[PDB]
Design a protein around this nucleic acid. Structure first.
Ligand SMILES: [K+]
Ligand SMILES: [K+]
Ligand SMILES: [Mg+2]
Ligand SMILES: [Mg+2]
Ligand SMILES: [Mg+2]
Ligand SMILES: [Mg+2]
Ligand SMILES: [Mg+2]
Lengths: 231, 64, 20, 294
RNA sequence: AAAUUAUUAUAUUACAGGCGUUACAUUGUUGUCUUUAGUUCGUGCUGCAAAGUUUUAGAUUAAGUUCAUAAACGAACAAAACUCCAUAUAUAUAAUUUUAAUUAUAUAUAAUUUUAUAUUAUUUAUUAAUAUAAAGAAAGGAAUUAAGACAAUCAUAAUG
């Protein structure tokens, strides 16, 4: 019957009672489920780790008192519980981990699978300096047209021609596709490399397994360099 | 620091007093090894269970 | 002269405020 | 949804019914309204827009960019008051803030009592009603810095309840002496101690105490003797509840060190008759008190 | 009910005007310039006290760069964050002859990237430097505090 006022958290007298209480809750789970094996897909580097930001955790983990090393300690325990084998996990672990996932999941993604159009053509756009290129890639025999003109006519420099061919040379498919490239703006180098960038982005639809090789060759990266007004 | 604050705040204190420790700084000293986790956890456990029995006796008198 | 004696009048003045 | 005139005529004013009828004849019932994610035309809340809000809408009759009255038909002829008072309660006082209607009514003792109660748990009523505060030293000190001489106010005060409890407090402030006294009063309450008193009027026997350079010689006195001691000791005795005392200060007569020495002497240099009796296992009798007993 | 008042012109006199004066004194202005994790304040603690607040002459980065730590803790302060631009993407708008839709410009999202592994160091651990593999379009800028000490006539604004 008699009532008294007491500190809410067992860690009240510590420097950061809120962070220590949360760490204790996670530590209990890691002790109760010490035996449960961890994922063997961790070697496969599963791409899932959407934990809240240091600033977002500061709302619940002491605010100003929160130290970066304290946030690092929270992530080491959230990941360890998360990496328990999915088949052998339980509700308790997932319930505790739910509160620490980024709330961006509230909404949805903005990416729709790219597919060939009604005529079997992969359409991609590329940009370099002030130049732009819209290419139409279809399965063919290596025919290329630039703005309706022969490649040797539009691009006089052999180095520009070699730049256009490089993405097809990486996937060793130079004679497997017909390319209809349309380009505008900038000069020969910007247009040739804008076409290079657009062909690489259009080739991924035909075989998405080759994206990693295209990325490694450097043809899927948009070159950011542009003329800078002297400051 | 904590012991001096306890004195200033009139908070009774218990502490494990090793041979190099000042006994008069605490209300109820417990002479004992403070360097071994076994000795510390043994003494802490005894004090913790004593507290538990007090808590259980307080919750029992409320029921009846 | 300034520093030492100035406060004699002010500290007594502080006591003036106390009654106020 | 399209509603019959009967229903709409029981909620909306007659003047607006024609507009509702025309809108229900131009917008098909199967209209799939889309939400605009570029321009926000409507407010962030629901509103039928049938009533003019006295604050959130333009004041009728006031000139403004979208005033529909002719320039010779405005109805604001007095300009001594604010035309549109704040809506609702009439204030925007932040939650947890109080309107400063009354200023200068605070009692520094009550400010000390409230702060100490929150910080240490002492009773505010005792501090504000039972304690008497007396400043003992008030001076200005100065520190020589690269920028120049930085002055500070130093205050030493004694507090007591005249019934055994006495405390000494010190305070410093670079701003004003009143702030230094507030801190000293705050410190003094935290240092409150009980001092033994023989018959609640004097000390037990005589005391020869050395506090730094101060030599204190205090002697107990008969009832009705009064306080015959250094002026600094007098104030402390008054607060503590000592009525009869004689004494002399030798060597250093620094006021600050006399006050601290006196407090220390009253606690560390006295022994009650009860404490002496228990330690020695003997009975100590006050002959003067027995002479007037039954 | 001819006097009044309005406008205009002329005249009258205080003046107006002055690229006259920094050997005309001050204020602005902007400049350069250091300072920009340091002050002040609150509380606590040490010293009788003036005062001090202690680890620390910390680690680390090109660099407050980033992170630790102490009888100190916190606030304000300002950096930083943030913010905008660029870039990538999504939605909306255009009856695709104002055509550049390969575009225009509103809104939103994204990174101050992330993960595994080996090597070398370490304060050796839940680590940095490295390389290797994987995911990714992701690679660049902008503005930003208050003081202190000093410069310019500003034909770039004032006041006497
Ligand atoms: K201080
Ligand atoms: K077009
Ligand atoms: Mg030991
Ligand atoms: Mg003139
Ligand atoms: Mg001239
Ligand atoms: Mg002191
Ligand atoms: Mg600090």
């Amino acid at each position: 019957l008699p009532r008294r006022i007491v500190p809410k958290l067992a860690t009240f007298y510590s420097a950061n009672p809120n962070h220590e209480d949360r760490i204790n809750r996670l530590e209990r789970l890691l002790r109760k489920y010490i035996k449960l094996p961890s994922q063997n897909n961790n070697e496969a580097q599963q791409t899932k780790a959407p934990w809240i930001s240091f600033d977002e955790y500061a709302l619940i983990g002491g605010g100003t008192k929160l130290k970066p090393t304290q946030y690092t300690q929270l992530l080491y325990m959230l990941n360890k519980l998360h990496n328990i084998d999915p088949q052998l996990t339980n509700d308790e672990i997932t319930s505790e981990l739910s509160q620490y996932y980024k709330k961006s999941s509230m909404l949805s993604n903005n990416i729709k699978i790219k597919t060939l159009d009604e005529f079997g053509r992969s359409i991609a756009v590329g940009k370099r300096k002030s130049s732009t290129a819209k290419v139409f890639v279809v399965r063919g025999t290596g025919e290329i047209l630039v703005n309706g003109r022969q490649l040797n006519d539009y691009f006089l420099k052999m180095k520009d021609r070699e730049s256009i061919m490089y993405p097809l040379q990486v996937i060793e498919s130079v004679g497997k596709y017909n390319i209809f490239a349309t380009t505008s703006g900038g000069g020969p180098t910007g247009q040739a490399e804008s076409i290079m960038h657009a062909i690489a982005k259009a080739l991924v639809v035909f075989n998405p397994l080759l994206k990693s090789r295209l990325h490694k060759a450097g043809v899927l990266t948009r070159d950011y360099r542009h003329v800078e007004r002297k400051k | 620091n904590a012991l001096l604050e306890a004195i200033k705040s009139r908070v009774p204190t218990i502490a494990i007093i090793d041979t190099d420790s000042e006994p008069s700084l605490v209300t109820y000293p417990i002479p004992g090894n403070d360097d071994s986790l076994r000795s510390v956890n043994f003494l802490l456990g005894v004090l913790a269970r004593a507290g538990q029995r007090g808590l259980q006796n307080r919750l029992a008198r409320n029921n009846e | 002269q300034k520093a030492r004696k100035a406060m004699e009048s002010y500290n007594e003045l502080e006591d003036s405020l106390q009654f106020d | 949804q399209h509603y019959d005139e009967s229903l709409l005529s029981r909620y909306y004013p007659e003047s607006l019914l024609k507009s509702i009828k025309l809108a229900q004849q131009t917008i098909p019932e199967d209209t799939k309204f889309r939400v605009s994610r570029n321009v926000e035309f409507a407010p962030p809340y629901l509103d039928d827009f049938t009533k003019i809000h006295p604050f959130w809408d333009y004041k009728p009759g006031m000139p403004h960019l979208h005033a529909q009255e002719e320039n010779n038909n405005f109805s604001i002829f007095r300009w001594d008051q604010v035309q549109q008072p704040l809506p609702g309660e009439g204030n925007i006082l932040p939650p947890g803030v109080s309107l400063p209607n009354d200023g200068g009514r605070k009692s520094k003792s009550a400010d000390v009592a409230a702060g100490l109660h929150k910080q240490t748990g002492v009773d505010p009523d005792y501090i504000t009603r039972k304690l008497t505060m007396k400043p003992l030293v008030m001076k200005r000190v100065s520190n020589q810095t690269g920028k120049g001489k930085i002055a500070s106010f130093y205050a030493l005060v004694v507090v007591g309840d005249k019934n055994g409890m006495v405390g000494l407090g010190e305070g410093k402030s670079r701003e004003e002496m009143s702030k230094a006294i507030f801190k000293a009063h705050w410190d003094a309450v935290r240092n409150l101690k009980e001092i033994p008193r023989y018959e609640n009027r004097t000390i037990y026997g005589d005391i020869d105490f050395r506090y730094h350079g101060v030599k204190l010689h205090l002697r107990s006195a008969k009832p009705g003797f009064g306080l015959r001691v250094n002026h600094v000791i007098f104030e402390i005795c008054e607060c503590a509840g000592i009525k009869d005392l004689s004494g002399k200060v030798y060597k250093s007569r620094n006021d600050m060190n006399i006050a601290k020495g006196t407090i220390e002497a009253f606690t560390k240099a006295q022994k009650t008759l009860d404490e002496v009796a228990l330690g020695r296992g003997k009975k100590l009798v006050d002959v003067r008190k027995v002479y007037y007993s039954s």
